[PDB]
Design a binder for these strands. Structure first.
Lengths: 120, 149, 204, 78, 76, 129
RNA sequence: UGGUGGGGUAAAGGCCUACCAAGGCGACGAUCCGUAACUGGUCUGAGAGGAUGAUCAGUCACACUGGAACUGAGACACGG
RNA sequence: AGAAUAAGCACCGGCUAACUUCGUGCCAGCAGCCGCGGUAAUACGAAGGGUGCAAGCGUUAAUCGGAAUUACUGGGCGUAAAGCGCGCGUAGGUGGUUCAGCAAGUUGGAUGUGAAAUCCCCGGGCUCAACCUGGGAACUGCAUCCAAAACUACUGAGCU
């Protein structure tokens, strides 16, 4: 740790590994739905949430959350991916964005229309 | 001094076999606008008394900080426990550029361009200690050297 | 510029704002006795950073300025040498949006900012149309010679000694032409601001 | 190949020249041998036209550089 | 025009290599470190043994990895 | 082993400053004697006392203030390891210039005030404050 | 890796060559392995720095991929 | 000729002083950290109002920052993570003591540069701002040169 020992072997700053294995410094990355299904939350909560499995165009097998209150993503859609880790859902770190290509958009959704895919 | 500044409230608990009884400690400082700073907190049940049970000792232990006039004496190296404090004087025009509990003690002293910092622990219980040991040894002339400079 | 109805902006502050619509009063019929918002029949916890906000969010609501425009004016305060607070309101008084009314050609800043875009207020024999010109100490201030019989320019000459003189200009009322003499210090301003406390809303 | 030449700085519809001494092996706006003083044909009040210093301008004519076509009739403005 | 190093290897004719040592600072660490530089010096008459100290001069290259000749044996 | 002559004297008096002793004696060199002569001229100590015999020693007579004495700390900067050879533009004004910042130069092991008005820098030795 | 005889390049030089000798490089990181044009600079920073090379300018490098010369002042030549 | 051709976005449980209810009921959901929802919901869906700053507002992503969270400036190690189980000692790092010498590190000045751009101030101009340039400042750098000898290496005689 001394300045002699720094010239011998200097302090290497340890790199921080990124949170997303996919999205290789890309803000969005297109995918194709392998499977949409139902997932339970973590124990101190309880609900029924709907997540999707996608293969990406990087060929990767990760899960994205369909963030709508209603969707017609019918098992082969062309859904677009953002990041962000949903807390209550374990082990998954991606979200399907609304109104991208095949994501139809949440019904009425009258505030936050830029988030959940609504015109006007 | 009547230029008191509240530092922190923090909700203290302790347990009886009946259950958990809660108490509030709250530290405030008291300065005079010219450099007599004080310290203290109180142990009571309630919010509006634990800040004046802080005044119970905050007017006590007031010591005249040896100012220069609007500007601090030196670059400072100071510590208490696991908190360490850096300071240095600034020139003319910048205001309060300290942080958290450092802007409370260094604004009641008559200096305004303060530029104080916190290193090690950030606990405001032990933070206000190292700030006054930063101000306890201030002297432009009170060295025993037989020379004005 | 901020637009819309403006009786509701006279209520948050408590000061007259120099934002009005006529020539007799302000906050005298648009029922200023409460604190508006979503639900404001009760107050509570009126302290530092939200007050440092209400300082700057008053100064923003007077001077026709956006935060695109105004926090670039704190950028010149550090480009200024020393005394950053009053040197902020220097360029708000070398501002032409205010000093049309600080002379008094228009009713308020809402008529001052407007007519200079409508090719009224020249600077020095040129054609200036911006509400951001920086008037030097010692130019004339005149009006283009087609808005002279615009009679709402004559609807502003009644408040010269009624809103009080500024005692920093020397103007000719016959020509409708003025002259900005010198820049103010912090003695020529209204006492409702805190100039080195708008400064503190920069780091947090 | 060595040449004293007008070289476009400035903005679009805002010409400003440098009067670079170049090699005619490079572009107009890169790798000049020397910048002697400038030119500005949009010159209005307070802006000097051309900062032609004949202390160095003698040297490239002395060492064998040439005006292009216009550079000859900027020295004719003297 | 003066570079000085101590002789470390002489077993070839007309050619010698020396350690032109120096002690210079580390940029972000501040401690002055030594940085040894092992030049090659050309001898016209091959009179330098291991442990000698010489000075050298730069000219056109005398071989590959050799562009410095012998000036004078300063000491031994 | 001992590895630095003058850092061994600058430590041995500070624990004696917080102790109740006055005359400090140790086996001394000319290097430690040239340092001691400059801060008696700054009003800190007096009468360095070369013993002038074989194994020569330094009896520095440090002064007391009432209660806490005159020198709080002596902070070594250039120890022997990272030895802080510093220029004249970058001299340390230690405590606003109330530290005198003795710097070893060719024409004298000398304070920072005379190091700048006659410009030679070098070994920034220690905090005297 | 040197030494000389020659050979050769517009120009020094194991660059090419024959023969003589056993040297040369490297723990201050050689060689191998992965990665990347570099710099003036750029971005966050109290600064130290850290990250970084899009427009702009200098140098480098390439021209489907590889080898090769030719002509010419200048190429191993992007529309040879 | 005449206001005819122009505003939108996101939030409002906290530490952000923007902070009623209606529908929904451990459902449906939101969210960066706590968490919120299990029946009067300031945390979730509208309406009803405000507020952030505006032809943009937001959130996905990447960089540095706060981060003393790789600490040269500027951190650690009895019990939180961390003393090899300890030796002999190679390179190396550093080295008691005095005079003299050297001038490699150290110190000052000299000169060429460190291209132009960018930046930093003073300006000039676009009606103003970007932008544009003029002037310098800056470029902590590099070798050469002479001057210095307190300290370090090196050199020599020593001192205990």
């Amino acid at each position: 740790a001394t300045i002699n020992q720094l010239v011998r072997k200097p302090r290497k700053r340890m790199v921080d590994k990124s949170d997303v294995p996919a999205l290789q410094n890309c803000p969005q990355r297109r995918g194709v739905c392998t499977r949409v299904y139902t997932t339970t939350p973590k124990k101190p909560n309880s609900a029924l949430r709907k997540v999707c499995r996608v293969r990406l165009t990087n060929g990767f097998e990760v899960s994205s959350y369909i963030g709508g209150e209603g969707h017609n993503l019918q098992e082969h859609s062309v859904v677009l991916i953002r990041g962000g880790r949903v807390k209550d859902l374990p082990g998954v770190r991606y979200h399907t964005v609304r109104g991208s290509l095949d994501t139809s958009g949440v019904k009425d959704r009258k505030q936050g229309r830029s988030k959940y895919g609504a015109k006007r | 001094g009547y230029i008191e500044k509240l530092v922190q409230v923090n909700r203290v608990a302790k347990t009886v076999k009946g259950g958990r009884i809660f108490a509030f400690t709250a530290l405030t400082v008291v300065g005079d606008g010219k450099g007599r700073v004080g310290f203290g907190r109180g142990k009571a049940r309630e919010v509006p008394a634990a800040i004046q049970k802080a005044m119970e000792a905050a007017r006590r232990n007031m010591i005249q900080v040896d100012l220069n006039g609007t500007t601090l004496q030196y670059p400072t190296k100071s510590a208490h426990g696991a908190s360490k404090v850096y300071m240095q004087p600034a020139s003319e025009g910048t205001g309060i550029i300290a942080g958290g509990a450092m802007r409370a003690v260094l604004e009641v002293a008559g200096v305004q361009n303060v530029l104080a910092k916190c290193y090690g622990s950030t606990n405001p219980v032990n933070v206000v200690y190292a700030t006054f040991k930063g101000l306890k040894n201030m002297q432009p002339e009170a060295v025993a050297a037989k020379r004005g400079k | 510029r901020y637009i819309g109805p403006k009786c509701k902006l006279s209520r948050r502050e408590g000061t007259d704002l120099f934002l009005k619509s006529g020539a007799r009063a302000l906050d005298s019929k648009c029922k200023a006795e409460n604190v508006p918002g979503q639900h404001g029949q009760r107050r509570g916890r009126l302290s530092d950073y939200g007050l440092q906000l209400r300082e700057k969010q008053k100064v923003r609501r007077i001077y026709g300025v956006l935060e695109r425009q105004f926090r670039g004016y704190y950028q010149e305060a550090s480009r200024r040498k020393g005394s950053t607070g009053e040197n902020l309101l220097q360029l708000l008084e070398c501002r032409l949006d205010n000093v049309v009314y600080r002379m008094g050609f228009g009713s308020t800043r809402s008529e001052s900012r407007q007519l200079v875009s409508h090719k009224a207020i020249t600077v020095n024999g040129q054609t200036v149309n911006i509400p951001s010109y920086q008037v030097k100490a010692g130019d004339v201030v005149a009006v283009r010679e087609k808005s002279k019989n615009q009679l709402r320019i004559a609807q502003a000459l009644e408040l010269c000694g009624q809103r009080g003189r500024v005692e920093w200009v020397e103007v000719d009322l016959d020509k409708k032409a003025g002259t900005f003499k010198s820049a103010p210090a912090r003695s020529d301003l209204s006492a409702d601001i805190n100039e080195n406390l708008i400064v503190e809303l920069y780091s947090k | 190949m060595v040449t004293i030449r007008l070289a476009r700085g400035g903005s679009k519809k805002r010409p400003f020249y440098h009067l670079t001494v170049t090699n005619s092996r490079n572009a107009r706006d890169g790798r000049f041998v020397e910048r002697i003083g400038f030119f500005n044909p949009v010159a209005t009040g307070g802006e000097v036209r051309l900062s032609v210093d004949q202390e160095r301008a003698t040297y490239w004519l002395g060492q064998g550089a040439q005006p292009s076509e216009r550079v000859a009739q900027l020295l004719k403005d003297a | 025009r003066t570079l000085t190093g101590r002789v470390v290897s002489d077993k070839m004719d007309k050619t010698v290599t020396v350690l032109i040592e120096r002690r210079v600072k580390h940029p972000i660490y501040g401690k002055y470190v030594k940085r040894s530089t092992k030049l090659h010096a050309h001898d016209e008459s091959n009179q330098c043994r291991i442990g000698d100290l010489v000075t050298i001069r730069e000219t056109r290259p005398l071989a590959k990895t050799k562009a410095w000749t012998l000036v004078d044996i300063v000491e031994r | 082993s001992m590895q630095d002559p003058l850092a061994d004297m600058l430590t041995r008096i500070r624990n004696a400053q917080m102790a109740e002793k006055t005359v400090v004696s140790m086996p001394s060199s000319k290097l430690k004697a040239a340092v001691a002569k400059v801060l008696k001229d700054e009003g800190y100590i007096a009468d360095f006392q070369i013993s002038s015999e074989v194994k020569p020693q330094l009896s520095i007579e440090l002064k007391y203030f009432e209660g806490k004495p005159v020198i709080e700390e002596v902070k070594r900067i250039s120890r022997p390891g990272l030895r802080q050879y510093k220029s004249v533009e970058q001299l340390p004004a230690v405590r606003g210039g109330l530290g005198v910042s003795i710097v070893s130069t060719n024409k004298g092991v000398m304070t920072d005030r005379a190091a700048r008005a006659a410009g030679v820098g070098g070994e920034v030795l220690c905090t005297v404050f």
